[PDB]
Amino acid sequence: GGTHIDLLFHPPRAHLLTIKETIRKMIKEARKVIALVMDIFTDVDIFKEIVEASTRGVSVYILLDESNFNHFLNMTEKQGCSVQRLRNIRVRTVKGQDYFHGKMEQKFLLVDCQKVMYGSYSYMWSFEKAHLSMVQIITGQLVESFDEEFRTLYARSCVPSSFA
Amino acid sequence: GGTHIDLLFHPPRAHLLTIKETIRKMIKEARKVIALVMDIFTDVDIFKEIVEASTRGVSVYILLDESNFNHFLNMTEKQGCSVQRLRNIRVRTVKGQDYFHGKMEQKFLLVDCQKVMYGSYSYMWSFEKAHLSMVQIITGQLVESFDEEFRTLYARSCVPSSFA
Numbered sequence: 001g002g003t004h005i006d007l008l009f010h011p012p013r014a015h016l017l018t019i020k021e022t023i024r025k026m027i028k029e030a031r032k033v034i035a036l037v038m039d040i041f042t043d044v045d046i047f048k049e050i051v052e053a054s055t056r057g058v059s060v061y062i063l064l065d066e067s068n069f070n071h072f073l074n075m076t077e078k079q080g081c082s083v084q085r086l087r088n089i090r091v092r093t094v095k096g097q098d099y100f101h102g103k104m105e106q107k108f109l110l111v112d113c114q115k116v117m118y119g120s121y122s123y124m125w126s127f128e129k130a131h132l133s134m135v136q137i138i139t140g141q142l143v144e145s146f147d148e149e150f151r152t153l154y155a156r157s158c159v160p161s162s163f164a
Numbered sequence: 165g166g167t168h169i170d171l172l173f174h175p176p177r178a179h180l181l182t183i184k185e186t187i188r189k190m191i192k193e194a195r196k197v198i199a200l201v202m203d204i205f206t207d208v209d210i211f212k213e214i215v216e217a218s219t220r221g222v223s224v225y226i227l228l229d230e231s232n233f234n235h236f237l238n239m240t241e242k243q244g245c246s247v248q249r250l251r252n253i254r255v256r257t258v259k260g261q262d263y264f265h266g267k268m269e270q271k272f273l274l275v276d277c278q279k280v281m282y283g284s285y286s287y288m289w290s291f292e293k294a295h296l297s298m299v300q301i302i303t304g305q306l307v308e309s310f311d312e313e314f315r316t317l318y319a320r321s322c323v324p325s326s327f328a
């Protein structure tokens with residue numbers, strides 16, 4: 001049992017799907033669990049795909065950088081889609097060390113302890129339209145290190161202040 | 165010929181060096197070539213290590229996000245260490261698509277077509293002190309895909325405006 005890695009780019013270079021399509025497809029094909037670590041999450045199309053996964057019964061764990069969490073909240077409000085009322089979705093925040101806000105500068109998407117997308121793509125309009133980025137699609141043994149990291153992050157996460 | 169990957173964290177988790185020490189060590193041990201793709205580069209200790217590599221005769225190619233390039237220039241000026249007068253160092257900028265500045269959201273360090281550090285760590289004080297991040301140390305076949313990507317980026321880079 002080794003590790004396999006494909007590179008994807010935005011803009012695309014020698015692969016048929018954009019990074020965003022690949023994300024939406026990875027969410028679409030989730031069977032059991034989605035673990036997401038994201039710095040900024042405002043992309044409505046990716047959000048919808050996640051909500052939909054949850055309604056099929058997939059458990060979804062999301063960890064967001066605390067300092068940008070408001071941009072996610074704003075987006076969920078616009079979508080008339082309160083994350084607290086969705087029973088299969090947990091969302092917690094992670095911060096770094098303050099001095100100036102320390103941040104969780106990590107991002108990745110993990111599905112079913114089977115596939116990871118790891119890279120520089122944030123779930124925002126601007127990464128679809130403006131930014132250059134790259135990700136890895138990872139399968140095999142190294143996905144276990146992404147579980148351990150996700151669990152580790154989750155262990156240090158807080159319930160966002162908005163939730164009473 | 166496969167690929168090998170180790171994960172490093174900041175803060176450190178089960179490895180002896182911090183990400184910053186590992187960077188400085190990778191630069192220290194460079195023999196021939198350093199290729200760096202960086203979103204923001206203001207860390208004086210990493211800069212010094214690069215200058216020093218260059219004076220030993222290592223060719224250094226740096227690609228920086230255009231929109232943050234001024235922060236690098238400012239730092240080099242403070243250090244009394246003009247990058248244009250250093251014969252072994254080339255620096256070019258890369259931008260994304262504008263609308264709001266599109267950015268090069270990619271970063272990695274490549275040494276000698278042998279080792280890559282790929283991850284969320286930017287070469288700034290704040291990643292040593294405040295931010296949570298992670299990188300991969302990559303060796304083996306996948307390093308060739310980082311050459312191709314670096315060459316591709318380099319092909320799309322511009323001479324910064326400051327250089328006449």
Ligand SMILES: COc1ccc(-c2cc[nH]n2)c(O)c1
Binds near residue numbers: 035110111113150
């Ligand atoms: C906090 O604990 C968790 C929660 C979820 C996962 C996971 C795996 C694949 N998708 N989601 C995990 O690996 C650990």
Ligand SMILES: COc1ccc(-c2cc[nH]n2)c(O)c1
Binds near residue numbers: 198310311
């Ligand atoms: C723009 O062309 C280049 C320049 C430098 C490299 C390199 C390899 C290892 N370090 N630096 C490369 O792979 C392609």
